[PDB]
Structure formats: C-alpha cells, structure tokens
Amino acid sequence: LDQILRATVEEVRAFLGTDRVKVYRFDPEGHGTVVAEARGGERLPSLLGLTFPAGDIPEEARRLFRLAQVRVIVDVEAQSRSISQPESWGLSARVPLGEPLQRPVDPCHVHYLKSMGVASSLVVPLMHHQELWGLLVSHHAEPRPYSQEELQVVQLLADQVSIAIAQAELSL
Numbered sequence: 001l002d003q004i005l006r007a008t009v010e011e012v013r014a015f016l017g018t019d020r021v022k023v024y025r026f027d028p029e030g031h032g033t034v035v036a037e038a039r040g041g042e043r044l045p046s047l048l049g050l051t052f053p054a055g056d057i058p059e060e061a062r063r064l065f066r067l068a069q070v071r072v073i074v075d076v077e078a079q080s081r082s083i084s085q086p087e088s089w090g091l092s093a094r095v096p097l098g099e100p101l102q103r104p105v106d107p108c109h110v111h112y113l114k115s116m117g118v119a120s121s122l123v124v125p126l127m128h129h130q131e132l133w134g135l136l137v138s139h140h141a142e143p144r145p146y147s148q149e150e151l152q153v154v155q156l157l158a159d160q161v162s163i164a165i166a167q168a169e170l171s172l
C-alpha cells in the first residue's frame with residue numbers, strides 16, 4: 001500500500017506536469033499522513049511523513065467529496081471568496097453542484113496556499129463505495145485552468161486508485 005501509492009504519484013505528476021502532486025490518506029480518528037509525493041525540480045519542499053491535524057478539515061466540505069466528488073480552488077489572485085452563514089450545511093450536499101463554473105474557498109485556506117507559493121490547486125478524492133479514504137491534490141504555482149476531459153480521466157485514475165487501496169487492503 002505504501003509502496004504502490006508512491007509509484008502512483010510519480011506517473012500522475014508526469015501526466016499533469018504539475019509542480020507537486022501528493023496522495024493523502026484518511027484515518028478513522030480524522031488524522032491523515034502524506035504517503036506519496038513528487039516534486040517538480042525540488043521547487044516545493046517534501047512534506048512526506050508529516051501529519052496534518054484533523055481540525056484542518058471541517059466536515060461539511062469533506063462530505064461533498066464523498067457525495068459529489070467535485071472540488072477545485074481558483075486563482076488566489078482572482079480573489080474568489082467563500083463564507084459561512086448563521087446556519088450550517090450537511091446533508092444539503094445531496095444537491096448536484098448547482099453553482100457557477102467556479103468554486104470559491106474561504107480566505108483561511110486561500111492564503112495558506114499563498115504561504116505555500118501556490119495559486120491554484122485541483123482537488124480529487126479517493127473513495128470506495130460510500131466511503132472516503134483519502135484526498136488527492138495537485139499544486140500549480142501559476143494560473144492553469146483544468147479541461148473537462150483531463151479532469152475526468154484523472155477523476156477516474158483517482159477512482160482507479162481509490163479502488164487499489166481497497167483491493168490492496170484485503171491483503172493486510
């Protein structure tokens with residue numbers, strides 16, 4: 001599982017030629033670890049083996065990956081902003097998209113990317129059946145919109161990967 005996933009990130013980056021792409025796995029307690037990472041000329045630092053507090057991932061957003069498998073972050077420069085409301089959303093995700101061709105992310109996560117030298121990142125999750133196992137993410141330091149065609153093939157690759165983690169799991 002740890003070996004396969006490492007190989008998966010190597011070919012993936014090559015296909016997108018993105019500066020950095022890493023695979024992230026979700027643990028039952030909310031914590032996750034970086035088990036796969038590729039660097040575009042050591043441009044970005046290696047976060048391999050580092051743990052990211054679960055508190056970093058709320059809940060409403062995580063459900064959307066499990067329910068709709070669709071989320072991307074736009075040009076931090078375009079200044080697209082997201083905000084919460086007196087009320088909280090949950091199962092409401094049962095709705096398919098229903099938003100402009102773009103998705104805004106609150107300013108908190110936005111600068112975090114800026115602080116990381118990232119301006120636009122594509123997000124694709126890894127899931128099996130009704131369960132979400134991890135989160136894939138590509139980092140683009142400069143504006144780079146995604147194509148509807150390439151997006152699926154990858155979404156499929158992720159799905160193909162999500163399937164691998166499932167099939168490999170039985171082994172252990």
Ligand SMILES: *[C@@H](C)[C@H]1/C(=C/c2[nH]c(/C=C3N=C(/C=C4/NC(=O)C(CC)=C4C)C(C)=C\3CCC(=O)O)c(CCC(=O)O)c2C)NC(=O)[C@@H]1C
Nearest residue numbers: 024052055056057058061062065082104105106108109135
């Ligand atoms: C800011 C951190 C506040 C917040 C808002 C917020 N952030 C997200 C969700 C994400 N955070 C990501 C983090 C990264 N980058 C990594 O390197 C890494 C560890 C390997 C991850 C997973 C990130 C790109 C996401 C999306 C993935 C996910 O499913 O969470 C969101 C959701 C997006 C949306 O607009 O719905 C927002 C708005 N969360 C807080 O509690 C902070 C106060």
